[PDB]
Short mmCIF file of C-alpha atoms and ligand atoms in Angstrom, two decimals:
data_model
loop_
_atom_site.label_atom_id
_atom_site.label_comp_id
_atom_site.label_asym_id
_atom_site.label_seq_id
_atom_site.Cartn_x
_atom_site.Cartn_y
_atom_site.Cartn_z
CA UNK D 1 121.60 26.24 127.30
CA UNK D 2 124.85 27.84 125.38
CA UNK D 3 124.62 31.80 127.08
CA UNK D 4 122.45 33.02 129.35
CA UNK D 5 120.33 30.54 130.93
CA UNK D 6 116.45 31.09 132.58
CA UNK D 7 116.71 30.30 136.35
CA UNK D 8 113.96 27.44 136.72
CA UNK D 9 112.33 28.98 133.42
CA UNK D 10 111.71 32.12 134.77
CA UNK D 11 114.05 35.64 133.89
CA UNK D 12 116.12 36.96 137.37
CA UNK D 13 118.38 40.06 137.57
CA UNK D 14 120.90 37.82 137.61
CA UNK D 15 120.11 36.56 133.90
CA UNK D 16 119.71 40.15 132.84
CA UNK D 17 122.70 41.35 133.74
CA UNK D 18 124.52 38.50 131.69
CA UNK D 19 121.92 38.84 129.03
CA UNK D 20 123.07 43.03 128.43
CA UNK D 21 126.60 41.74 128.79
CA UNK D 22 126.28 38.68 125.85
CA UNK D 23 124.79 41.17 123.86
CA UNK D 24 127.49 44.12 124.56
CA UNK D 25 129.57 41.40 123.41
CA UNK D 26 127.82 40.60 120.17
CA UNK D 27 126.49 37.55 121.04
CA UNK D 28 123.00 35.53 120.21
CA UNK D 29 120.68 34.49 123.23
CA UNK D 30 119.78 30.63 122.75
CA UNK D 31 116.49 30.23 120.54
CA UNK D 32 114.65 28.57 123.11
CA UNK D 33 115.80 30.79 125.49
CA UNK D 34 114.42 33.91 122.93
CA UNK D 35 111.10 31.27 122.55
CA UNK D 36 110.44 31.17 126.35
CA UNK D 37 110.70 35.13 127.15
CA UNK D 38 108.63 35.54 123.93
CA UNK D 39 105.84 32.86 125.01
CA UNK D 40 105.84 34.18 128.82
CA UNK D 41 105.95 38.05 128.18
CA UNK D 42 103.03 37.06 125.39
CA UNK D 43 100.77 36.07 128.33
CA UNK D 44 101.89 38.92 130.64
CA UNK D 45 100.73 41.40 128.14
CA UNK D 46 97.86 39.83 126.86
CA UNK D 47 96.30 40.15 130.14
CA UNK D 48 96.57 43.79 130.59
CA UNK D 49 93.99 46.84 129.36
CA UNK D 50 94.90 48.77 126.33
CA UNK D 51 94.98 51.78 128.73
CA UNK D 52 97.81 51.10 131.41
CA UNK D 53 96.70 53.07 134.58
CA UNK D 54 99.72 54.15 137.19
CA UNK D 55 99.59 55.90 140.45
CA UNK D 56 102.74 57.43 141.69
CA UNK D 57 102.79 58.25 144.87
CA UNK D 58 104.23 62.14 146.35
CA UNK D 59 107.84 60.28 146.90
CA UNK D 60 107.57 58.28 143.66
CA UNK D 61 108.72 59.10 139.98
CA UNK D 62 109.15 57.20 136.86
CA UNK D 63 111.29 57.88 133.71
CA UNK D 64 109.89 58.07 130.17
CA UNK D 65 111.61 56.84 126.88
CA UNK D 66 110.47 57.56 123.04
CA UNK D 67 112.05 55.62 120.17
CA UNK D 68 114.99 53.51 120.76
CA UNK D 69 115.06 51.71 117.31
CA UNK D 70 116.92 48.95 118.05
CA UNK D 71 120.20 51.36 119.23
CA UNK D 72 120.70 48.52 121.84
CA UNK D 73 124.06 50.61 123.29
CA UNK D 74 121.88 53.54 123.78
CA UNK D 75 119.54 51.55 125.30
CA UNK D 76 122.46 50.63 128.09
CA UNK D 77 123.46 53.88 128.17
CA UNK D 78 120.23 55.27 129.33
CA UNK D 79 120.67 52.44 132.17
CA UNK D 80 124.57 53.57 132.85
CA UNK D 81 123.12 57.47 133.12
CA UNK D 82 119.59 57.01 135.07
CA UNK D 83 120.02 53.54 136.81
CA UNK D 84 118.81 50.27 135.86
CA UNK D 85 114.79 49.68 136.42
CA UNK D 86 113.63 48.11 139.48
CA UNK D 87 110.69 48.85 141.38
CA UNK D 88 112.62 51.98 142.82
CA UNK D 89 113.23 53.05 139.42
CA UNK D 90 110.63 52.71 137.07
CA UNK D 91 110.45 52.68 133.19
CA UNK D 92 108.16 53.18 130.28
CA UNK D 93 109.43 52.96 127.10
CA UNK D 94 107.09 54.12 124.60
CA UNK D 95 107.17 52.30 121.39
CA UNK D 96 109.67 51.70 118.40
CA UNK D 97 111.46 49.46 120.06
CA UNK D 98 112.95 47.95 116.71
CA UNK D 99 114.36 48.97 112.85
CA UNK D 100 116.15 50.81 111.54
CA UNK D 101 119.27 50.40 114.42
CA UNK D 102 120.81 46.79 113.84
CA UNK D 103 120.59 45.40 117.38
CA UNK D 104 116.71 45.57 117.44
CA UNK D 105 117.19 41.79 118.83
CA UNK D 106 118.96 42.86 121.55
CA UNK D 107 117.06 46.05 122.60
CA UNK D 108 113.53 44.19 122.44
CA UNK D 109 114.93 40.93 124.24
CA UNK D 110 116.04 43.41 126.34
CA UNK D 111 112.75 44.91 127.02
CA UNK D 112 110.79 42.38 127.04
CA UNK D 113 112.99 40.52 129.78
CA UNK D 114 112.96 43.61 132.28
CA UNK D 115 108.61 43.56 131.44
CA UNK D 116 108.71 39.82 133.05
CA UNK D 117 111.17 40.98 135.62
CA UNK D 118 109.74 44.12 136.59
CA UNK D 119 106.10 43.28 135.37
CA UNK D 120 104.40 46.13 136.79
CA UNK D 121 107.51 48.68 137.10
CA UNK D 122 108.73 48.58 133.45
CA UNK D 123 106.09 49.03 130.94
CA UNK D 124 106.16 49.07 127.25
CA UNK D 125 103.36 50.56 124.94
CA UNK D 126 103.41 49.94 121.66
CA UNK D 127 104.67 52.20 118.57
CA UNK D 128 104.06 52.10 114.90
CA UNK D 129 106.95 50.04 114.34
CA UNK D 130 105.72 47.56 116.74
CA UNK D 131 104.02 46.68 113.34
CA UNK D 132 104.22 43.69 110.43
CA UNK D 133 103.95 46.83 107.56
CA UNK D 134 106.70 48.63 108.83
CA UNK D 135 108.76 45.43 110.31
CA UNK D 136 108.99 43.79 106.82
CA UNK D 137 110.89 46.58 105.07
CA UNK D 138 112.86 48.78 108.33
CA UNK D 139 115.16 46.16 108.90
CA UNK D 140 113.44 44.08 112.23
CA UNK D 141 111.86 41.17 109.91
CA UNK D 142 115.42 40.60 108.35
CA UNK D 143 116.96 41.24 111.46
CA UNK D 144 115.13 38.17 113.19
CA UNK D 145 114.87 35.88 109.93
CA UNK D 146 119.17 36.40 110.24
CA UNK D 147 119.23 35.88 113.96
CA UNK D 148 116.65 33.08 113.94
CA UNK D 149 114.15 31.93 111.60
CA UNK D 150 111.10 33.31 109.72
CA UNK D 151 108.66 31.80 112.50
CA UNK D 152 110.28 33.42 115.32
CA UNK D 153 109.44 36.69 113.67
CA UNK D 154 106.30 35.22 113.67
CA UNK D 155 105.99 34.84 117.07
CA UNK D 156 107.28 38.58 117.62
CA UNK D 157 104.78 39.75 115.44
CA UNK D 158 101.74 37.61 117.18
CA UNK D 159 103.34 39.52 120.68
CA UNK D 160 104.09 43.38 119.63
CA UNK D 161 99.63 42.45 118.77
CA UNK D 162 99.61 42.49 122.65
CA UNK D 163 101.55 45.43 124.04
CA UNK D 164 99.22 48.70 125.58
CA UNK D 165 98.50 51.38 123.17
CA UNK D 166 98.63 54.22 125.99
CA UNK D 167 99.24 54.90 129.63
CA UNK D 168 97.83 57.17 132.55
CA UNK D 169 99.76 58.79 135.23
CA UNK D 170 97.43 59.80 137.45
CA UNK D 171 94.46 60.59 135.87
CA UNK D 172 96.81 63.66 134.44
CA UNK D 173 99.24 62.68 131.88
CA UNK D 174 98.86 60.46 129.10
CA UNK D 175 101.18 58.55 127.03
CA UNK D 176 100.93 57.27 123.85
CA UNK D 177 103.71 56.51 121.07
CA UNK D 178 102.22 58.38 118.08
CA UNK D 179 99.37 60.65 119.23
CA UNK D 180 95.86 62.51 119.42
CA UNK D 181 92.69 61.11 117.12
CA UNK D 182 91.32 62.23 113.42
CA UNK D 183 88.11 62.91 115.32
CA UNK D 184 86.35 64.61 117.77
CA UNK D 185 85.27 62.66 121.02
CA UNK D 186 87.21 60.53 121.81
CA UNK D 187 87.33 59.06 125.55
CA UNK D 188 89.84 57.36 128.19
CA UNK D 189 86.87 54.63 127.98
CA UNK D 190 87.21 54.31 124.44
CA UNK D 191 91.22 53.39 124.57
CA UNK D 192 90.61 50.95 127.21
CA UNK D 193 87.92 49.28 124.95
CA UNK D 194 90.52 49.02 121.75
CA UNK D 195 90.69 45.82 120.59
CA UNK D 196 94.56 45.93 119.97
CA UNK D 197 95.50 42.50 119.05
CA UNK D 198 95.49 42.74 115.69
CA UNK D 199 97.78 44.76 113.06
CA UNK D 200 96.22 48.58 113.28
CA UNK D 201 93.73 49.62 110.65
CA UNK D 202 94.08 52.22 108.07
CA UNK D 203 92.45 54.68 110.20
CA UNK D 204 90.44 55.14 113.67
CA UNK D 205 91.65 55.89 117.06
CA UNK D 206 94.38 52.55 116.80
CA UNK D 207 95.70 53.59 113.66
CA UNK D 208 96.01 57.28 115.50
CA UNK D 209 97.36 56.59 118.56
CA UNK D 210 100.88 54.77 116.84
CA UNK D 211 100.79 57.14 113.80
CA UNK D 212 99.61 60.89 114.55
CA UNK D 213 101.62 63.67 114.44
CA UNK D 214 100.99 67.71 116.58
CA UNK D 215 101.00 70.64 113.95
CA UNK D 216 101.31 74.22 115.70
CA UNK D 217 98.56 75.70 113.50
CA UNK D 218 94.38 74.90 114.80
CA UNK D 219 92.51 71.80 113.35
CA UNK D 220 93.85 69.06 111.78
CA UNK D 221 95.70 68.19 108.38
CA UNK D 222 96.33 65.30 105.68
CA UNK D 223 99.18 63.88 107.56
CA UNK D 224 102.67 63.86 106.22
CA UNK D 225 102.97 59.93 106.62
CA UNK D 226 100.32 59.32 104.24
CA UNK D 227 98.08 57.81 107.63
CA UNK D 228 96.13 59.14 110.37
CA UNK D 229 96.64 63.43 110.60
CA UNK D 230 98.71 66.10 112.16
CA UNK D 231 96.77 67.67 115.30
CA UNK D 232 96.71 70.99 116.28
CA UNK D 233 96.94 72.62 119.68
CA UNK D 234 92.84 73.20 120.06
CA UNK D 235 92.14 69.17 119.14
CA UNK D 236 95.13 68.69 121.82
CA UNK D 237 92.91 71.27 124.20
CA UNK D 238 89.57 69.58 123.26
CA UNK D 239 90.94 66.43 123.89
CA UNK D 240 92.59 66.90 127.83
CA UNK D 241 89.39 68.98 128.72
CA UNK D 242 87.16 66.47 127.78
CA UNK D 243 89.01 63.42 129.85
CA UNK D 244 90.25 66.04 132.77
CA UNK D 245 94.46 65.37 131.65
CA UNK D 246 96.82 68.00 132.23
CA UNK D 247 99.04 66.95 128.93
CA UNK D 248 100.53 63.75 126.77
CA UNK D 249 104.06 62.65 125.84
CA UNK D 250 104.73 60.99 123.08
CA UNK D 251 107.26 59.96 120.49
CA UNK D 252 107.35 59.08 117.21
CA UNK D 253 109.44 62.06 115.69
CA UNK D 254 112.86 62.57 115.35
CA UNK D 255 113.97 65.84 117.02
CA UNK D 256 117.09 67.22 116.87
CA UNK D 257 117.39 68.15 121.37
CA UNK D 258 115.47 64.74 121.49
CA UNK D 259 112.31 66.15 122.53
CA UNK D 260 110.27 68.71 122.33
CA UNK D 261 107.17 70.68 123.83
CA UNK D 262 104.55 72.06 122.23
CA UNK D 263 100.23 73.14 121.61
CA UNK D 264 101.58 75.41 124.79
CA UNK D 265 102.77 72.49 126.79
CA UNK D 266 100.19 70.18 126.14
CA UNK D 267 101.90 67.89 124.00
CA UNK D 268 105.07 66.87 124.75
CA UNK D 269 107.49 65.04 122.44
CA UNK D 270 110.50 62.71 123.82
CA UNK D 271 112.72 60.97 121.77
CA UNK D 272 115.54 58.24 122.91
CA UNK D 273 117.76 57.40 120.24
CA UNK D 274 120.47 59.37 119.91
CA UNK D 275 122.51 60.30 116.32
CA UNK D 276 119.73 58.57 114.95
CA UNK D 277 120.30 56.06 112.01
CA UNK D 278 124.15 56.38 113.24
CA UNK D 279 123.40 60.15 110.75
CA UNK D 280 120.85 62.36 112.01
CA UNK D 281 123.44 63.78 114.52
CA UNK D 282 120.42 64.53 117.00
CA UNK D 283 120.52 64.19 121.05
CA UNK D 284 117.95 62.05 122.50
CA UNK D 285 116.46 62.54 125.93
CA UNK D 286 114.60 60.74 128.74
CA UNK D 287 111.88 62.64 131.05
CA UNK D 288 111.41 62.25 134.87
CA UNK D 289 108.07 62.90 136.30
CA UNK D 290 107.42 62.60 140.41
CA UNK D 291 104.38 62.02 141.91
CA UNK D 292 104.36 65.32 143.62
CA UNK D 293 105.52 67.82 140.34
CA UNK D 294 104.08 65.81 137.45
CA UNK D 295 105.85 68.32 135.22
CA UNK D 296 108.57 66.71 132.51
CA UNK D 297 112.41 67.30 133.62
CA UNK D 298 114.34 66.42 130.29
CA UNK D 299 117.73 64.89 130.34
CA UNK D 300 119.69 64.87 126.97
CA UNK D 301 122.33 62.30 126.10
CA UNK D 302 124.29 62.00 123.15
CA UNK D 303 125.42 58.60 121.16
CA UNK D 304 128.01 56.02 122.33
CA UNK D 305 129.81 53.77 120.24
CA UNK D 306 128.67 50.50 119.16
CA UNK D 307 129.97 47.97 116.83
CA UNK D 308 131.06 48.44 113.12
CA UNK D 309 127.52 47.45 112.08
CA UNK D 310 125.55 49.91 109.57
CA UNK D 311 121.97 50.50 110.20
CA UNK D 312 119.75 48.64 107.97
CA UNK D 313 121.98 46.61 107.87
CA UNK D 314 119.03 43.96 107.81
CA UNK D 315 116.42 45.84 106.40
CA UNK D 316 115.11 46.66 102.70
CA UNK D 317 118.30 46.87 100.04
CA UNK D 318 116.79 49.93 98.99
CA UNK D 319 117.36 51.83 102.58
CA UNK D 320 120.46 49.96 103.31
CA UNK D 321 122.56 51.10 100.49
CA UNK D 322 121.49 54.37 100.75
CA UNK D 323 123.21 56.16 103.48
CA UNK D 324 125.98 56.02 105.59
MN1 LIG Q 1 106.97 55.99 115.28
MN1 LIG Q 2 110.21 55.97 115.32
#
């Protein structure tokens, strides 16, 4: 009831736009305001496949994010430079929504407001850090437990279990936040089957598709993360012949142009948070695919200012004093 208010419980453009403009301005979104976009986007996403399937039409294209990481003026300025989503301009943002960047409230509010706005034009899959492991010590646990209280974290937690694990662009590009599988065989019937809601496992195709990482050379390798492997272009090969796919974007790594292409165009990296960690000094980039030329077009941004808040700022002591 104090900021931004739900029109007759339910999120309007009108309530976004004041929603990015409390937060520009620093400010908290009521609690029970937070509770209702967290309970209603909970049933949205709980009743969708683990494998998102799209068509775009000839005239139609969509844009695809990596990482934001809780960058929350990024995340506007990715709006200010391609347009705000609408059904005219769709999004996916794929995974790592939150930690590490210190408005991970903000950016996933964000999200998770345009999902129940936009519900089938704005779609979020989930990344690794869409995780309880990785939330309890990369700032987004702290982050909430600051903002709110330990059982609204709770409730975040008990939602990221919900988001899609991958998406399909017409039968011919796939999208994932991490990447390709530890093993052979792997189907699109298999993903759709995943039972997500749950934290991933140590290993299998869950665990892969939020954690794996492309290698240039053939086969696979011990991965660098200490979970799931590195891929190499032939398991990236074996893969899209098998399930007739042209290539995948993903995330999940840091690149210095913000994305990158690679396993000779077959695996595409894009990554949307830009002078990442307020350090790494990298671009970041968003893709554009169209319906009738599914091939990427990047777009590189660089960082815009935000307020004198340090990343990590909320997460573990031994990551927040440790940079800058
Ligand atoms: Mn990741
Ligand atoms: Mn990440």
């Amino acid at each position: 009831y104090s900021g931004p208010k739900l029109e007759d419980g339910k999120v309007t453009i009108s309530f976004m736009k004041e929603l990015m403009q409390w937060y520009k301005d620093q400010k908290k979104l009521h609690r029970k305001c937070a509770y209702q976009i967290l309970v209603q986007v909970k049933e949205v996403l709980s009743k969708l496949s683990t494998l998102v399937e799209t068509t775009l039409k000839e005239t139609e294209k969509i844009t695809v994010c990596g990482d934001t990481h809780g960058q929350f003026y990024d995340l506007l300025n990715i709006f200010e430079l391609n347009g705000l989503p609408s059904e005219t301009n769709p999004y996916i943002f794929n995974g790592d929504f939150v930690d590490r960047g210190s408005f991970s409230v903000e950016v996933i509010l964000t999200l998770f407001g345009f999902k129940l706005l936009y519900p089938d034009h704005f779609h979020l899959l989930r990344g690794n850090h869409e995780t309880d492991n990785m939330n309890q010590i990369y700032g987004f646990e702290g982050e909430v437990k600051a903002k709110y209280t330990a059982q609204m974290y709770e409730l975040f937690s008990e939602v990221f279990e919900w988001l899609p694990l991958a998406q399909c662009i017409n039968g011919k590009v796939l999208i994932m936040h991490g990447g390709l599988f530890s093993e052979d065989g792997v189907t699109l019937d298999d993903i759709r089957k995943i039972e997500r809601n749950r934290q991933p496992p140590d290993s299998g195709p869950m665990c892969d598709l939020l954690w794996s990482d492309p290698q240039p050379q053939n086969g696979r390798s011990i991965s660098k993360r200490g979970v799931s492997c590195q891929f190499g272009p032939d398991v990236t090969k074996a893969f899209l012949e098998e399930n007739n796919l042209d290539y995948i974007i993903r995330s999940h790594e840091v690149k210095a142009e913000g994305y990158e292409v690679a396993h000779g165009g077959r695996c595409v990296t894009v990554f949307s948070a830009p002078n990442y960690c307020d350090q790494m000094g990298n671009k970041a980039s968003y893709i554009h695919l169209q319906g009738s030329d599914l091939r990427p077009q990047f777009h590189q941004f660089t960082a815009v200012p935000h307020p004198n808040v340090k990343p990590m700022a909320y997460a573990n002591t031994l990551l927040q004093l440790g940079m800058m």
